[PDB]
């Protein structure tokens, strides 16, 4: 499933992240354009020996189970690959928690400098709420 512009912006609020734990609608949408290019199928292995699974570029090392990354906490405890299907209904379980960790959105490399402080009111622009 390859999503359109206004095809990826409503299902995020459908799952409750709106201003989630101090994280608003303004902070989400840019990042997937820069981790997956609005793609659900973008698998890339980072030199850390981990791969980045899903549209969120998750490293199997800290949070999931891929079987080729030993010493991984596999904290989420699910198929690291279920993190890949069009049905994302369960992937954010670990998105809503990786942040209580307290070091922030700073778990991702691009939005931090590619997407922070930038005009965000604009990603939510041109669309209906």
CATH number assigned to the domain covering 1-129 = 1.10.530.10
Helical (H) or strand (E) element with 44: strand 44-45
Tokens 């604009």 belong to residue: 122
Q: What are the φ/ψ torsions at residue 111 (nearest 5 degrees)?
A: -50, -30
Task: Say if residue 48 carries a ligand binding annotation.
Answer: no
DSSP reduced 3-state for 51: strand
7 catalytic, yes or no? no
Decide if 8 contacts 32 (C-beta within 8 A): yes
User: Taking the CB of residue 52, how many other CB atoms lie within 10 A of it?
Assistant: 19
Decide if 50 contacts 60 (C-beta within 8 A): yes
- Cα 55 to its chain centre, rounded Å, is 6
Catalytic residue among 7, 18, 35, 48: 35
Resolution of the entry in angstroms: 2.9
Would you state the structure tokens that stand for residue 13, as one six-digit string?
């609020």
CA dist 129 and 125 (Å) reads: 10
Is residue 102 exposed (0-12), middle (13-18) or buried (19+ Cβ within 10 Å)? exposed
Strands (DSSP E) found in the chain: 44-45, 51-53, 58-59
52 catalytic, yes or no? yes
User: Among candidates 10, 16, 20, 25, which has minimal Cα distance to 100?
Assistant: 20
Catalytic residue among 7, 18, 52, 66: 52
- What's the alpha-carbon Rg for the chain, to the nearest Å? 14
Tokens 């700073």 belong to residue: 106
């Amino acid at each position: 499933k390859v999503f359109g512009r206004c095809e990826l912006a409503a299902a995020m609020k459908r799952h409750g992240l709106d201003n989630y734990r101090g994280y608003s609608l303004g902070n989400w949408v840019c990042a997937a354009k820069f981790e997956s290019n609005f793609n659900t199928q973008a698998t890339n292995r980072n030199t850390d020996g981990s791969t980045d699974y899903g549209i969120l570029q998750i490293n199997s090392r800290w949070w999931c189970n891929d079987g080729r990354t030993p010493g991984s906490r596999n904290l989420c405890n699910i198929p690291c690959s279920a993190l890949l299907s069009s049905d994302i209904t369960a992937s954010v379980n670990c998105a809503k928690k990786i942040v209580s960790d307290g070091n922030g959105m700073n778990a991702w490399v691009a939005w931090r400098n590619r997407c922070k402080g930038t005009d965000v009111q604009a990603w939510i622009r041109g669309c209906r709420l």
